[PDB]
Design a protein around this ligand. Structure first.
Ligand SMILES: CCCC[C@@H](CN[C@@H](CCCC)C(=O)N[C@@H](CCC(N)=O)C(=O)N[C@@H](CCCNC(N)=[NH2+])C(N)=O)NC(=O)[C@@H](NC(=O)[C@@H](NC(C)=O)[C@@H](C)O)[C@@H](C)CC
Length: 203
């Protein structure tokens, strides 16, 4: 299918014999599912997100059916806020990111989808994150008026400054919209701007 990003890219998955809902997340290295029992041996691991680090159980070689496409790989189980399918399984089902419906660059997901953006007259690297509702940029002295906001994800919440109607060029594509500034480890381009550049998931 081709999936646009006007809404969250939520799909049904089958895992351990049971159906769950999960978000197709290009900003996630790994697949993370809410606490559940899985048949297997597991081992403890720690993973991080926008809000810090959490402890998870790592299960290897778990079969997962994702909107009808088969994958067999690593699944992490823990207190994630949202079930997410990350790049480790997206690559298995042949998922790519495509601009302008496939007329623009195609980005594979073997590595993190990092691209060059321009914002406030600065060039920066940013992650294309289909699991992010909003765009979050590293501490930057952006001029303008703003309002406080808290945003969350794996690990909890951070406080950010919300600026509206900020122009942002993404791999040469112009966009304009809301940008959140705060202490993120990685600059993230979220759906609010991805939709403006015609980005789709395809598999
Ligand atoms: C769980 C909530 C949904 C998915 C998540 C994916 N975001 C990426 C951002 C990148 C880090 C800042 C992420 O956490 N990725 C993790 C997922 C966990 C994982 N293991 O894959 C990751 O790749 N972590 C790497 C660390 C990043 C660096 N890795 C690297 N360079 N190889 C890791 N291995 O631990 N989205 C979010 O965190 C966003 N949250 C949201 O969109 C919504 N919030 C919630 C609570 O649902 C919205 C209502 O605010 C943030 C950015 C605000 C817009």
């Amino acid at each position: 299918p081709q999936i646009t990003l006007w809404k969250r890219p939520l799909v049904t998955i089958r895992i351990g014999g049971q159906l769950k809902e999960a978000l197709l997340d290009t900003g996630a290295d790994d697949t993370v599912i809410e606490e559940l029992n899985l048949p297997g041996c597991w081992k403890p691991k720690l993973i991080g997100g926008i809000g810090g680090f959490i402890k998870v159980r790592q299960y290897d070689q778990i079969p997962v059916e994702i909107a009808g496409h088969k994958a067999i790989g690593t699944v992490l189980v823990g207190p994630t806020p949202v079930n997410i399918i990350g790049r480790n399984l997206l690559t298995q089902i042949g998922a790519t990111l495509n601009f302008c419906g496939g007329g623009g660059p195609q980005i594979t997901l073997w590595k993190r989808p990092l691209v060059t953006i321009r914002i406030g007259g600065q060039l920066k690297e940013a992650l294309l994150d289909t699991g992010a509702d909003d765009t979050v940029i590293e501490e930057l002295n952006l001029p303008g008026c703003w309002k406080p906001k808290l945003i969350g994800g794996i690990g909890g919440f951070i406080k950010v400054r919300q600026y509206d109607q900020i122009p942002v060029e993404i791999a040469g594509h112009k966009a304009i919209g809301t940008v959140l500034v705060g202490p993120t480890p990685v600059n993230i381009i979220g759906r609010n701007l991805l939709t403006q550049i015609g980005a789709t998931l395809n598999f």
